[PDB]
């Protein structure tokens, strides 16, 4: 039906992002080619293709549709969410310019418990777990008790157990944002993986590899690897300027560490709040207009080597505030590095 199936979906021509499933994209359609497209789309499935350049991408489902004729042109304003990754097969460019795409739906491998086949029948009843850290030593003794019947030990079976992985990820996430450790993140592995990938400070090529990973467990196991191996963040361009390091990430507000903020011109800036940054030159004089973190004053910050924008250096206006100097670094500019292969 849908998984591992070859469909054709139209392509928003002006697009490029690596759309991680579950992310949302705002959209403003001016040219009549794309306006007639979304018109057909919302009449039909309203799922279009976000080409992730190259031969991959993610289908995006329109969930908000608004035509607000303004400035004497039929502007259609839409919002979509990312559903399923895909590998392109054939791109056919229509006469209108709207490109159509034969598409192979990438896989989302749902997998049973590692102990589903070895679980002893008598032991099947004593499984449902009754609703600190000794709990996880006990969790591991119980769930993987039947591992003694196999040729591998319990602690290996835990390195592939979705529930154990998701907690290891969520604990490290807690060092960045001491905050909601519950509804904040999802409960299904398939969603929890795609959520972690969209709120990690990773570059587009790491996103793209997590997106190509088939099973949600392999995707978690890798997300855990990135959080353990790629602990130094560098300049994406000159690739020779360590900016910050994993232990300096915090979360100034309750919205995350690397939340997404909007400048007064609609540019979005996943900005990873860190405590200390290095090898950054400050461009201009501090300002507080449109300051995303009220009470701090922003100063543009670029690389000391290639002068490529990295973020801002936010300064405490008052004296009560703590911290007083932090730095905001846009995700676009960073690149994770291992101070060695990422595994799955």
């Amino acid at each position: 039906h849908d998984d591992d199936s070859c469909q054709v979906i139209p392509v928003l021509p002006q697009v490029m992002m690596i759309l991680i499933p579950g992310q949302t994209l705002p959209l403003q359609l001016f040219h009549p080619q794309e306006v007639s497209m979304v018109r057909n789309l919302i009449q039909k499935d309203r799922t279009f293709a976000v080409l992730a350049y190259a031969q991959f991408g993610t289908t995006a489902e329109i969930y908000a549709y608004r035509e607000e004729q303004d400035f004497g042109i039929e502007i259609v304003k839409v919002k979509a969410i990312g559903r399923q990754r895909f590998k392109v097969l054939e791109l056919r460019t229509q006469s209108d310019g709207i490109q159509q795409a034969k598409v192979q739906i990438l896989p989302e491998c749902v997998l049973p418990s590692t102990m589903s086949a070895v679980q002893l029948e008598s032991l099947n009843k004593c499984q449902i777990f009754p609703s600190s850290y000794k709990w996880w030593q006990k969790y591991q003794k119980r769930k993987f008790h039947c591992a003694n019947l196999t040729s591998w030990p319990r602690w290996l079976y835990s390195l592939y157990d979705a529930e154990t992985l998701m907690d290891r990820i969520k604990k490290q996430l807690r060092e960045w944002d001491e905050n909601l450790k519950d509804d904040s993140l999802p409960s299904n592995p398939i969603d929890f993986s795609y959520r972690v990938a969209a709120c990690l400070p990773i570059d587009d090529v790491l996103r793209i590899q997590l997106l190509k990973i088939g099973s949600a467990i392999q995707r978690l196991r890798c997300e855990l690897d990135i959080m353990n191996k790629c602990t130094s963040l560098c300049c994406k361009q000159c690739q020779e300027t360590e900016i910050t390091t994993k232990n300096e990430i915090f979360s100034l507000s309750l919205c995350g560490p690397m939340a997404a903020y909007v400048n007064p011109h609609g540019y979005v800036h996943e900005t990873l709040t860190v405590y200390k940054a290095c090898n950054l030159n400050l461009i201009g004089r501090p300002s507080t207009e449109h300051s995303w973190f009220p009470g701090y004053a922003w100063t543009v910050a670029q690389c000391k080597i290639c002068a490529s924008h990295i973020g801002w250096k936010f300064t405490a206006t008052k004296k009560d505030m703590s911290p007083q100097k932090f730095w905001g670094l846009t995700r676009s500019a960073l690149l994770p590095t291992i101070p060695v292969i990422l595994c799955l």
Partner: peptide, 26 residues
């Protein structure tokens, strides 16, 4: 005003410099 960067907000003294900054975003 004609010297502020739309993307990061940097206000240069000269337009002929804000153009050199404009490169740095791609």
């Amino acid at each position: 005003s004609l010297t502020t960067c739309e993307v990061c907000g940097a206000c240069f003294e000269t337009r002929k410099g804000l153009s050199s900054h404009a490169r740095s975003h791609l």
